Structures are given as structure tokens and as C-alpha cells.
GROMACS .gro file of C-alpha atoms in nm:
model
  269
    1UNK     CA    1   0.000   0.000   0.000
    2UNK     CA    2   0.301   0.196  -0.064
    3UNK     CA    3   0.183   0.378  -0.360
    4UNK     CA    4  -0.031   0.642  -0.150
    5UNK     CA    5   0.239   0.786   0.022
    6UNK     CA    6   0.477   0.805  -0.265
    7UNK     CA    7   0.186   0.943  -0.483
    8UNK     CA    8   0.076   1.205  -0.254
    9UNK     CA    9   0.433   1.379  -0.231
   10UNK     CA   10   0.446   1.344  -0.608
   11UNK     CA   11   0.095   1.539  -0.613
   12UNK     CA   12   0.252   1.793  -0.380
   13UNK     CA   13   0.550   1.864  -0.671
   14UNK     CA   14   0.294   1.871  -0.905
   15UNK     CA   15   0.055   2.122  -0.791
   16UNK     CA   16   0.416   2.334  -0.663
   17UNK     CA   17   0.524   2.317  -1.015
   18UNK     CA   18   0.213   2.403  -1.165
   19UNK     CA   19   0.235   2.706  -0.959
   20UNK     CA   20   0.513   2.846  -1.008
   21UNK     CA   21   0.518   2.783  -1.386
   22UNK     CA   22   0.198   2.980  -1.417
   23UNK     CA   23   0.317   3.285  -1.206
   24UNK     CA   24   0.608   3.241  -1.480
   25UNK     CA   25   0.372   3.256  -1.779
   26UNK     CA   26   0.196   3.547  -1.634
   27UNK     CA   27   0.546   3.755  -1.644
   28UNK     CA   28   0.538   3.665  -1.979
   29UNK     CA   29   0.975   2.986  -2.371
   30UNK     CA   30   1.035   2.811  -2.067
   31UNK     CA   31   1.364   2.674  -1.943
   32UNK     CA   32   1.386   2.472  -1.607
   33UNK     CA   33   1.687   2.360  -1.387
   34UNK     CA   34   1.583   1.996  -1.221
   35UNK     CA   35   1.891   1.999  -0.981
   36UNK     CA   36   1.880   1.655  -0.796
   37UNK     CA   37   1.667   1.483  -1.066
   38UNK     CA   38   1.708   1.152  -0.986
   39UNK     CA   39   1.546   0.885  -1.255
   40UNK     CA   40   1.286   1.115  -1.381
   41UNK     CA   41   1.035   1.148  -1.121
   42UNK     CA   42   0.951   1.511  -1.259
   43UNK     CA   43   1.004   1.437  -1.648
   44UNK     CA   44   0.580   1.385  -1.700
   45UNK     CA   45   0.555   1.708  -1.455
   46UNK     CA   46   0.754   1.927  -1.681
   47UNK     CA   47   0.583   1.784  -2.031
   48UNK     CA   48   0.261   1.857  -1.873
   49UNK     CA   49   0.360   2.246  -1.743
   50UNK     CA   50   0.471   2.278  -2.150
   51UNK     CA   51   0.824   2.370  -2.132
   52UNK     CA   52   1.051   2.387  -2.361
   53UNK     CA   53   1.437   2.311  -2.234
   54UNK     CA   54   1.505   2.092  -1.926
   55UNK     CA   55   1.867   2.056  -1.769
   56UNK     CA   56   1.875   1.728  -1.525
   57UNK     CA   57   2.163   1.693  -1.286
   58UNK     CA   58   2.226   1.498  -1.017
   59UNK     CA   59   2.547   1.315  -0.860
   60UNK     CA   60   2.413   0.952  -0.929
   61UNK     CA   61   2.553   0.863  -1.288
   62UNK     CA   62   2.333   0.570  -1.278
   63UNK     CA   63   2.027   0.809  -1.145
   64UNK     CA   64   2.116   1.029  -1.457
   65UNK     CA   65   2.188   0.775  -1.752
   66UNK     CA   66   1.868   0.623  -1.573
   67UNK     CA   67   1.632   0.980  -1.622
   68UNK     CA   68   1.823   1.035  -2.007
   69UNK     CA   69   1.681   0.656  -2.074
   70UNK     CA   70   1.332   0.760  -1.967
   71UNK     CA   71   1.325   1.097  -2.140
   72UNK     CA   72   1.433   0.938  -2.453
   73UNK     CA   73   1.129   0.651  -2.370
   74UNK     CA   74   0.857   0.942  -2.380
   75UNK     CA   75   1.031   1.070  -2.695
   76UNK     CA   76   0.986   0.750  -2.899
   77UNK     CA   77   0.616   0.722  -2.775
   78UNK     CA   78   0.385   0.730  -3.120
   79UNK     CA   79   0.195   1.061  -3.153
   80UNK     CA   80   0.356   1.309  -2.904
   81UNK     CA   81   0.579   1.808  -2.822
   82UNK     CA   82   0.814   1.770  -2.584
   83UNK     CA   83   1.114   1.987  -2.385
   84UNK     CA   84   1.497   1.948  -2.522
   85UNK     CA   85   1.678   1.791  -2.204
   86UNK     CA   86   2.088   1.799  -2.127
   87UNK     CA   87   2.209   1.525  -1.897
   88UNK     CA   88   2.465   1.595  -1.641
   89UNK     CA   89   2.625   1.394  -1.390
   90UNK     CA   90   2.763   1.641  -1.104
   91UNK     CA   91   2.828   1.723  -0.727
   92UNK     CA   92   2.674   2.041  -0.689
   93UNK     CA   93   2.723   2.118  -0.361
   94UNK     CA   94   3.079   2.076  -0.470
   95UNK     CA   95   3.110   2.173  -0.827
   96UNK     CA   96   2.957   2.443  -1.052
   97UNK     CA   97   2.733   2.370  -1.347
   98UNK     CA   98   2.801   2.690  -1.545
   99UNK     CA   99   3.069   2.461  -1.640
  100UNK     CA  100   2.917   2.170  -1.688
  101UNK     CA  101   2.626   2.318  -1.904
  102UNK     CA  102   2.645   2.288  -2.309
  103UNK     CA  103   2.514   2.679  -2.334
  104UNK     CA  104   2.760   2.812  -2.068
  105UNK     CA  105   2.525   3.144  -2.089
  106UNK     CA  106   2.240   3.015  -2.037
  107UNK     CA  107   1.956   3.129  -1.812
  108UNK     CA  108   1.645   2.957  -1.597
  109UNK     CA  109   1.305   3.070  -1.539
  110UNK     CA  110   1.272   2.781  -1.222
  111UNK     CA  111   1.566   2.581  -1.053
  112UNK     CA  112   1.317   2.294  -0.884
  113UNK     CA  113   1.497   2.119  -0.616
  114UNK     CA  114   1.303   1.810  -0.515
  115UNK     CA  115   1.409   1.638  -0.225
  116UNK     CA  116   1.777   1.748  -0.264
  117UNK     CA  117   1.912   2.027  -0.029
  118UNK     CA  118   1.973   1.869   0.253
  119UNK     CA  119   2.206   1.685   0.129
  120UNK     CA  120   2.415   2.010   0.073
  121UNK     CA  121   2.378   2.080   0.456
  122UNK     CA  122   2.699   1.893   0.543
  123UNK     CA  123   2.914   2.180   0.521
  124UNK     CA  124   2.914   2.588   0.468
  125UNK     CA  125   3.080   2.544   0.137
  126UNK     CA  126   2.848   2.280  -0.023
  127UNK     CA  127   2.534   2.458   0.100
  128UNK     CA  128   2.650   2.743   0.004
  129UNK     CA  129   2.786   2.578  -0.373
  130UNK     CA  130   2.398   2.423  -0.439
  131UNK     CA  131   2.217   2.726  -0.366
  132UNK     CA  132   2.465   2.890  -0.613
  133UNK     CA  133   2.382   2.593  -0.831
  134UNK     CA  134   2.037   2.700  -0.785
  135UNK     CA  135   2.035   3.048  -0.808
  136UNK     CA  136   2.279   3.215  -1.009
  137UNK     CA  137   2.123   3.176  -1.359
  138UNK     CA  138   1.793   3.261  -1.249
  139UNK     CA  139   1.641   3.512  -1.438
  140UNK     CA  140   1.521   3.821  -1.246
  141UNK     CA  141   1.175   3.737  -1.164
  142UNK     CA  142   1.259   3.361  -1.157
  143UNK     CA  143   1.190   3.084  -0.847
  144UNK     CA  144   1.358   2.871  -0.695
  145UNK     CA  145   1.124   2.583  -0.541
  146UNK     CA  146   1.190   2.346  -0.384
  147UNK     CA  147   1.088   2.056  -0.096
  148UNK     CA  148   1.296   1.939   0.173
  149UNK     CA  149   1.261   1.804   0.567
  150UNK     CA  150   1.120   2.065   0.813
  151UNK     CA  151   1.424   2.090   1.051
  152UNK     CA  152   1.158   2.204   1.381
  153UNK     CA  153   0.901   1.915   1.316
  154UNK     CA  154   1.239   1.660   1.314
  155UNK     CA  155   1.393   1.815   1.633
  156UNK     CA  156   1.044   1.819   1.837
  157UNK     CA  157   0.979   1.462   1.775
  158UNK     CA  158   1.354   1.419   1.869
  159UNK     CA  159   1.313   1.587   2.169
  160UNK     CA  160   0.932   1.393   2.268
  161UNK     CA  161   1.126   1.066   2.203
  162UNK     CA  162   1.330   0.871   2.480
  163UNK     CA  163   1.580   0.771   2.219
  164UNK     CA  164   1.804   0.893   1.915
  165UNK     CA  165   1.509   0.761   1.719
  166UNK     CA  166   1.168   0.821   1.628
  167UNK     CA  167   0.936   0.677   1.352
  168UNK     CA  168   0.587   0.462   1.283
  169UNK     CA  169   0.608   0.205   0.972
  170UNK     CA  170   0.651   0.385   0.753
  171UNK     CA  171   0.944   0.617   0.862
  172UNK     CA  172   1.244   0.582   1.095
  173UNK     CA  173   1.483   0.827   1.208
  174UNK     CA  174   1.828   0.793   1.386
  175UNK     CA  175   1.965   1.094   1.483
  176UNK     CA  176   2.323   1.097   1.576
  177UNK     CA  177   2.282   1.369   1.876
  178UNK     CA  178   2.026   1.476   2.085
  179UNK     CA  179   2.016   1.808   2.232
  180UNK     CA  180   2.308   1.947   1.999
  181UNK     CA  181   2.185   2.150   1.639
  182UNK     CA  182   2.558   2.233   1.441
  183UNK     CA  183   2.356   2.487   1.138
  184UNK     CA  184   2.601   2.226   0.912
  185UNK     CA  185   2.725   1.856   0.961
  186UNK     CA  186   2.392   1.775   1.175
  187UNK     CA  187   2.363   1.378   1.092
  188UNK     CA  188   2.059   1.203   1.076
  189UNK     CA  189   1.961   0.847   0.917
  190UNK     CA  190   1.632   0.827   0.751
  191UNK     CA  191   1.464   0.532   0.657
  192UNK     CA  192   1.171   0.485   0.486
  193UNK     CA  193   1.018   0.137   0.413
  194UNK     CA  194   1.906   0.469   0.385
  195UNK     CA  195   2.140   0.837   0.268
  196UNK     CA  196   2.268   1.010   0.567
  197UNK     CA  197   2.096   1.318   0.587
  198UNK     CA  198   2.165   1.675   0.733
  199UNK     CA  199   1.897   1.922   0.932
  200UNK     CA  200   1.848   2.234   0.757
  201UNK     CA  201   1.779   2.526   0.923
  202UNK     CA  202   1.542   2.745   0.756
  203UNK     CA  203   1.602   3.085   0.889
  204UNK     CA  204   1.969   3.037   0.788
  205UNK     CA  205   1.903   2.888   0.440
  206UNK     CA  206   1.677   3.223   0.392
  207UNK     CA  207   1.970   3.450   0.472
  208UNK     CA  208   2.204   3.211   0.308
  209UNK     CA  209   1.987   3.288  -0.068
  210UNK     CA  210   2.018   3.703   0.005
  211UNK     CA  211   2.366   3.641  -0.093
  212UNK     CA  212   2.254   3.518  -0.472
  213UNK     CA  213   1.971   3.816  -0.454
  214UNK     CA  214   1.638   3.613  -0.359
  215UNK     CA  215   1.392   3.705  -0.187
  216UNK     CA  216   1.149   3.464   0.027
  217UNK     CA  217   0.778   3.382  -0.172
  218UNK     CA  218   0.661   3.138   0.097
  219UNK     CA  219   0.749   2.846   0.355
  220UNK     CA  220   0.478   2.590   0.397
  221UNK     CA  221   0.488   2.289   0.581
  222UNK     CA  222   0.321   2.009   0.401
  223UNK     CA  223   0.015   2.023   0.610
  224UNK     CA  224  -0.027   2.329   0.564
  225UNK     CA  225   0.012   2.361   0.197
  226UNK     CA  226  -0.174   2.064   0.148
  227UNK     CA  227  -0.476   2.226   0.352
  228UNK     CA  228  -0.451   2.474   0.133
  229UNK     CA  229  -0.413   2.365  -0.217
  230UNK     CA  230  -0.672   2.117  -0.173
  231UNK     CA  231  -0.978   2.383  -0.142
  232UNK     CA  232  -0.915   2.361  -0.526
  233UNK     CA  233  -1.146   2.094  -0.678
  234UNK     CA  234  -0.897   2.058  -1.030
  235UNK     CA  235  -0.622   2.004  -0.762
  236UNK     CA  236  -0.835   1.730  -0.587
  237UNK     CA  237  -0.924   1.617  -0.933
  238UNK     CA  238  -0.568   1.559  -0.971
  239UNK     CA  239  -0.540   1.395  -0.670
  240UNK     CA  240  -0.799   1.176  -0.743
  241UNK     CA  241  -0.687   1.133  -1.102
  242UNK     CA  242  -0.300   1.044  -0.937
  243UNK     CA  243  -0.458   0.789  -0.694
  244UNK     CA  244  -0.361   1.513   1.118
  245UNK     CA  245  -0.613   1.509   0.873
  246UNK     CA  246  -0.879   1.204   0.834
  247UNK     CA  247  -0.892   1.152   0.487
  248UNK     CA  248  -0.680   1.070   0.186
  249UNK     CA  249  -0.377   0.944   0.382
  250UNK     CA  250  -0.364   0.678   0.674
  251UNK     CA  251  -0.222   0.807   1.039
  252UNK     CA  252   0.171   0.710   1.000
  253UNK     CA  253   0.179   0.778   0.597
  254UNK     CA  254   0.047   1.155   0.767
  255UNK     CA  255   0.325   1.147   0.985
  256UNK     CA  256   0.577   1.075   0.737
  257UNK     CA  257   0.432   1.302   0.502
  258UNK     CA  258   0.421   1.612   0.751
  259UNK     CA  259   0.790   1.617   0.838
  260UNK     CA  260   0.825   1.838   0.464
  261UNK     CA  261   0.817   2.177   0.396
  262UNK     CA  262   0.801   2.354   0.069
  263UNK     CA  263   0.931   2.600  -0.039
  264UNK     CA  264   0.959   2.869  -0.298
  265UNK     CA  265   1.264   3.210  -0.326
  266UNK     CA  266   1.184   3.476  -0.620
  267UNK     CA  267   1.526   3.664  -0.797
  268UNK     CA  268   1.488   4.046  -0.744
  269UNK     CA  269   1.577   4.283  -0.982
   0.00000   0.00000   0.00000
């Protein structure tokens, strides 16, 4: 029974996408920067929003060869338009992708980052590095979205816990340390149904995006984004069409689900 809970956060990126690439279109030829891609989770999300160049990255080769295989897949489908897409395989909390691009000029109207930026957490530098990843060919006017674990929702359950870990399951999570918040190199193992992870402070990675001239659009925690974007019936639609409250999810998939945030930065002028 797996699917739900994988299928709900997917409808969360969808209806976060779908968004932001309509506050895009109302500014006025799309181009999008999936950093963290993975195998493709996003490729359908992106065909469906209508854009027209896609750059995938992310520091699996096999994750990347893996999302080029797929994209290729929904190009030989019979009777399809679809986005031009550039591969690349890269660290980038640790190396920049100006270099790595094709177009070494080239510009974004969204950076999505699914999933990904904690990962960067581990150190000033690489945190630092991905949000420059992010946000340096952005557009003015262009977002940077993204999802990623709400570091006061993990610490509280820490703290309510009489152990390192906490979880239902669905979900388990080891924290190295209790008590003791570093704003970089804060280990954590999560499991669900195993990547070291790192907490990510939100107030800092705020301040940390002034430095690449963003400013904040909004912080939601899945809960209450969900709450929210669900008062829409051709959201719910798509829910329904893709599949603590009392509906739609059971209990523990809830509490797995409601340790995210989303998240969304603009690029001033």
C-alpha cells in the first residue's frame, strides 16, 4: 500500500510546479533547472507544465543515464511536443554547473529542487555551492522551489522521544545527537520502508539565498500547503486522477508526510 504515500508527495511537486510555472507565464519559452533529478520522477511534470528546455543533474551517474533513458522513452512514444533535455552527472554542492552546461550562458526561469538540499547541509561550502547551483542563472523574476525536511518538526519529535530515534512504519529516524543542532554537519539516518541526511535550518538557508539576490515567496509545511491547495477541486481532481487530517492518507503515511516543507525564493531585480 506503498503507492499512497509516494503518490501524494508526487501530487505535492505537481501542484508546486504548476504554480510556479503559471506565475512564470503570467510575467510573460520556458527553461527549467531539475537539480537533484534523480530517474525522472519530474520528467511527466515538466511535459505537462509545456516547457521547452530541461537541464537534469544529479550526482548519481546511474540516477542520470537512468532519467536520459526515460526521457528518450517518452520521446519514442507514437503521436507526441516535448522539452529538449541535457544530462549531467555532477556534485553540486561541490562543483559548478556553469561549467558543466552545453550553453555556458544560459539562463532559468525555475531551478526545482526536489528532495535534494539537505544533502548540501553537510558543510558551509556545499550549501552554500547548491544554492549557487540553484540560483545564479535565475532570471530576475525567476523561483527557486523546492521541498525538503522541516528541521523544527524533526527536532520536536527528537526531543518527545526517549531515544536517538523516532518513527511509525513507515518512517524511521536515527539521529546521531540529541540536544546538539551544528547549522552544518547535523547527521541524521532516515529510513523509509538509507542516505545520511543533514537538518536544515530554515532561517539560515533564507539568509544564506540574500547572498545570490532572492527574496522569500513562501514556507509551507506540508500540512499546511496541502490544507490549502486542496480547497481547489482541479487540484483534488488531480489527486484523485494520481490515486492530522482524516482523509486521503492513513495516520503514519500523515506522519511521514508532515515532516516536509516547501518551499519557494523569487530573484529580485
Amino acid at each position: 500500500r506503498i503507492f499512497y504515500l509516494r503518490n501524494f508527495n508526487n501530487w505535492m511537486k505537481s501542484v508546486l510546479i504548476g504554480e510556479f510555472l503559471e506565475k512564470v507565464r503570467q510575467k510573460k519559452d520556458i527553461t527549467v533547472l531539475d537539480l537533484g533529478c534523480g530517474k525522472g520522477g519530474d520528467l511527466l511534470k515538466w511535459k505537462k507544465g509545456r516547457i521547452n528546455k530541461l537541464v537534469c543533474t544529479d550526482i548519481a551517474d546511474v540516477s542520470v543515464k537512468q532519467c536520459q533513458q526515460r526521457y528518450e522513452d517518452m520521446k519514442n512514444r507514437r503521436d507526441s511536443y516535448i522539452f529538449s533535455a541535457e544530462f549531467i552527472t555532477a556534485d553540486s554542492s561541490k562543483e559548478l554547473l556553469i561549467d558543466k552546461f552545453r550553453d555556458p550562458q544560459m539562463c532559468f526561469d525555475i531551478c526545482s529542487c526536489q528532495f535534494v538540499c539537505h544533502y548540501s547541509f553537510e558543510s558551509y561550502e556545499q550549501a552554500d555551492m547548491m544554492l549557487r547551483n540553484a540560483c545564479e542563472r535565475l532570471s530576475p523574476g525567476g523561483y527557486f522551489i523546492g521541498t525538503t525536511p522541516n528541521s523544527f518538526e524533526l527536532i520536536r519529535r527528537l526531543e518527545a522521544s526517549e531515544t536517538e530515534s523516532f518513527g511509525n512504519e513507515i518512517y524511521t529516524v536515527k539521529f546521531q545527537k540529541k540536544g546538539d543542532y551544528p547549522l552544518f554537519g547535523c547527521k541524521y539516518d532516515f529510513n523509509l520502508e538509507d542516505v545520511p541526511e543533514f537538518l536544515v535550518y530554515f532561517p539560515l538557508l533564507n539568509e544564506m539565498a540574500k547572498k545570490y539576490n532572492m527574496k522569500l515567496v513562501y514556507k509551507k509545511t506540508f500540512l499546511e500547503f496541502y490544507e490549502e491547495k486542496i480547497k481547489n477541486n482541479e487540484n483534488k481532481m488531480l489527486l484523485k486522477r494520481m490515486q492530522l487530517p482524516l482523509g486521503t492518507l492513513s495516520k503514519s503515511e500523515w506522519e511521514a508526510t508532515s515532516i516536509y516543507l516547501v518551499f519557494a525564493f523569487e530573484k529580485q531585480q
